[PDB]
C-alpha cells in the first residue's frame, strides 16, 4: 500500500517508535535515519505534534497512519484535522464539568477524540444518558459530538435537549483553552 | 428509556 | 466563542497611568469578565499591568505590560488576542512633541471600535483631522472636508475602491506608526495597500 | 449604510453637563461626522442638545435633547436612529438614592457597545454588580460568580437558552429602567423574555 | 546572627539563588561552592524540597531563613513543620472547592501555607466570609486555618457554623493527597 | 456585617 513512501518516526517513547515502523513496513513503506539520509515523504508524530527538525514531506499525526491502514486508503492529511498536529492550549482543562458522549465515530478517530476530550478535563461515556444513575454506574450527559444529522444519539439529544455539536468544537476549545460557544457549532445548522 | 445505547462497533 | 466562560478567569491586573474616571472603568470592566484587580502593596506580581496607549512607568514587575486598547478589544471579540499579534496592544513609541501630518486628512477604512478609536487619537495627536467619511472634494455647504490619506488593513471595501477610483494613497497602519515613531511624515509608496 | 456620505452633515449640536475630557472627546467625534459645534453665546437654536445618560439642565431652547449613549450609538452604526426608538437615547429617569438591586448579579444579552455600557451604567447606579459571563454557580477558584438576573431583547441566542435550562429569570430591558424609573426593585414575571 | 554558620543553596532559579545567599551574609554566614568544600552547616532549600547530593547539617527551607532572621532568633528547624520540606502529593488538587481564610499566621509562615493551599487547589482570600458578594467581589469562606481558640475569625466561625482547624489539617491534606477529615483536627478539641 | 477583615500586617 505504501509502496515508495518513506517515513521519519518522532517524538515517540522507544517501544512505540519501533511499533509504528514496523507498521508502516508491512504496507510496504520505507523507514529512515537520525541526522537523516534525504528528506522523507512523510513524518509521523504524536497527535499534539511535537518538535519536527528536518525538512520533511507532511507532517503527519499516528491516526492519519492507522485510519490509511483500517480503510486500506491513502487519505489525504488536509482532509481531516486529526492527521495533522492539532493545536492544544497547553495546561487548559475548558471542559471539566461537561460529559461527553460520541456518535457516528470509530476507531483511529473515536480514540484520538476521546484522548482530547479527556486532556481538556471532560469524563467520556461510551453511553448516552439523560439521567444520572448510581446502580449502572452512568452519569447524565452534558454534550453529544458527532458528523451527520440523525441516529439514535442524535434524536435523543433533541428529546432531551441537550447541544449535538460538531467535531469542530471540541477542536476550537482545544485550540482557545476556552469552552467554545455550543450555539456557534450545532449539528442544526451545518 | 433514559440511555441510549452505542455505536456497535 | 466563550459562551459562559468567563474571558480573564484566574487572571490579575494592575492598572497604572490612568485618570480616576478611567481607572474605575477599566477596573469595572475587567472585573465584569472575571480578571482581579492587584494593590500597590500587594504581595505578588501581576499576570498584565494596564496603561495608556502612549505607555507609562511601570516600576512593579508585571507578566506583561498591555494597554486599554488592547484590554477593550479583548473584551468585545470575547477572544483573548496576543498582544504581539498588533502593535497598538502595548505601548506605541512616539516622538514626542512632532506634528509631520499637520496639513493632512485621514478616514480608516476595516477599523472599527476600539482600534479606530486609538489609530484616531494618534493621528490626532500627530496633527492631521480625521473624518469619518472618504470624500474627494470639500463641500462646504455639506460642511465635509477632502480626505488626503486612506489608512486601512487589507485590499477591498468601499472606501478601498474609491481611494483607487480617485486616485488618493491607501496605505498600512504602519505608516502612521512609523511616522509617529519617527516624528518625521513617512513615504506613503512603501505602505501601498497594494503591495501586500 | 452611508458609504462616504457625511452622517451628521448640516446638522448642529450643543453638548451639556460633560466633564472637559468628555466634552472634547464627543465635541471631536461629532466633528469627524460632519457635525457643528455651537457656542453658549450662539445666534441660534441647535438641532441637538447632548446631554448625560441621566440628564442635566438644558436652559436653551433647542431642537431635541439626546443622550451621547445615542450620538456615539448613531455613529457607530452609520444609521440615523430615531432618538424616539430607545429609552436610553434620552434622558432616562431614575429616582435618585434608591439601590433596589442591591443583592442581584446581572448579565445582559444581545447588547453591545454603547448601549450595554449605559445599561451596565444603571445597573451599578442601582446597586447591581454586572458580570460579561453568564453561570448558574460561582467558582471561587476561577473567581466567576453566578449570575441572577439575564436581561435581553429579544427570545435566542446562547445565553437565553442557557436561562430557560436552569430556569433563572430572563427579562427585558424595561424590567431595569422601570425599576430605575420608580426607586423599588419592578417584578420579574411581567418581563419575561418568552411574553414578547 | 549568623556568625560560624555555613550554608549551601539548592534548587532555585541563578536569581533567588543569588539573592538568598546574599540576606546570608547580612547575618555573618558563609555560603559554600558545587563538589563543595567541607560539609555545611545547613542546607537552604525551597519548601517541597528538592534533591541533596551531599551530606549536609540539616535540610532547612528558605521560610526557616527568613522567619530565623525577621524574629533575629535561631529557630530549631524541628519546632515547626514549614521549616523543613513539606511532603506533597504531587499533581493532586484535593482542596479544589475550597476558599480558606488564616488567622493568626504572619509573613513567611502565612505566604508559605498560602503557598500550600493554592497548589492543592483551594483559592485564599484574605477576608473571612460567609455570603457570597458579586459587588465587593467576596465569595463564600469553607474553612478557617489557625493556631488558637480565639480572635475575631475564630468567633465568627463558630457563629456561622464554619470548621476551624489547625494547620496540621492543611499539611496532612497535602501529604496525602486527599481531603483531611476537618472533624479529626478541630480547634476546639486542641 | 457579615465579612471578617484581614489580619492587617
Not at chain 1, 37 to 63: F, I, K, M, Q, S
Amino acid at each position: 500500500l505504501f509502496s515508495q513512501k518513506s517515513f521519519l518516526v518522532l517524538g515517540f517513547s522507544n517501544e512505540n517508535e519501533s511499533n509504528i515502523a514496523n507498521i508502516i513496513k508491512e504496507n510496504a513503506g520505507k523507514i529512515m535515519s537520525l541526522l537523516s539520509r534525504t528528506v522523507a515523504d512523510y513524518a509521523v508524530v504524536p497527535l499534539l505534534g511535537c518538535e519536527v527538525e528536518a525538512t520533511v514531506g507532511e507532517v503527519v499525526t499516528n491516526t492519519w497512519l492507522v485510519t490509511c491502514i483500517d480503510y486500506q486508503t491513502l487519505f489525504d492529511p488536509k482532509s481531516n484535522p486529526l492527521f495533522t498536529p492539532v493545536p492544544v492550549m497547553t495546561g487548559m482543562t475548558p471542559l471539566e464539568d461537561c460529559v461527553i458522549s460520541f456518535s457516528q465515530c470509530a476507531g483511529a478517530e473515536k480514540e484520538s477524540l476521546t484522548f482530547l476530550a479527556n486532556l481538556l478535563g471532560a469524563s467520556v461515556q461510551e453511553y448516552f444518558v439523560r439521567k444520572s444513575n448510581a446502580k449502572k454506574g452512568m452519569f447524565a450527559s452534558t454534550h453529544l459530538i458527532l458528523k451527520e444529522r440523525g441516529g439514535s444519539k442524535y434524536e435523543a439529544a433533541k428529546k432531551w435537549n441537550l447541544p449535538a455539536v460538531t467535531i469542530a468544537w471540541l477542536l476550537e476549545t482545544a485550540r482557545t483553552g476556552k469552552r467554545a460557544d455550543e450555539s456557534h457549532f450545532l449539528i442544526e445548522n451545518s | 428509556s433514559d440511555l441510549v445505547a452505542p455505536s456497535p462497533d
